[PDB]
């Protein structure tokens, strides 16, 4: 019922970074998870999606090819591998559980990422 994500920091352009999100309080293997970012003072933006068993992955066109999402149902963790970062990727990244109908939607707290 709580989602904790970490791995943020300041990085130089063209480098790579990895984010992780720890989950607890529900059966992690029954739900599909999304990654959502929000630029400072701007609107929300969808990033990537992974199914409950990890068989299907979909990425937004802006980050297509550069990013990579994965999950580990054994350790209750999902990760986002980012390569070839740019200036426009500076945002606060969330780790959400959305489109669940009457079962409730939960969000993380975010990990600010800065590219200099």
């Amino acid at each position: 019922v709580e989602l904790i994500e970490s791995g943020g920091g300041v990085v130089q352009p063209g480098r790579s970074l990895r984010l992780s999100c720890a989950a607890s309080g529900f059966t992690f293997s029954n739900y599909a998870m999304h990654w959502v970012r929000q630029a400072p003072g701007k609107g929300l933006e969808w990033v990537a999606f992974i199914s409950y068993d990890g068989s299907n992955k979909y990425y937004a066109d802006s980050v297509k090819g550069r990013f990579t999402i994965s999950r580990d149902n054994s350790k209750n963790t999902l990760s986002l591998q980012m390569n070839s970062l740019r200036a426009e990727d500076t945002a606060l990244y969330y780790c959400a559980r959305v489109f669940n109908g009457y079962e409730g939607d939960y969000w993380g707290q975010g990990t600010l990422v800065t590219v200099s």
Binding site: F49, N56, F99
Partner: peptide, 14 residues
């Protein structure tokens, strides 16, 4: 914000 998906339910959008 309104949250939904495009024509084929594989890409979501805010």
């Amino acid at each position: 914000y309104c949250y939904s998906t495009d024509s084929s339910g594989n890409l979501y959008v805010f």
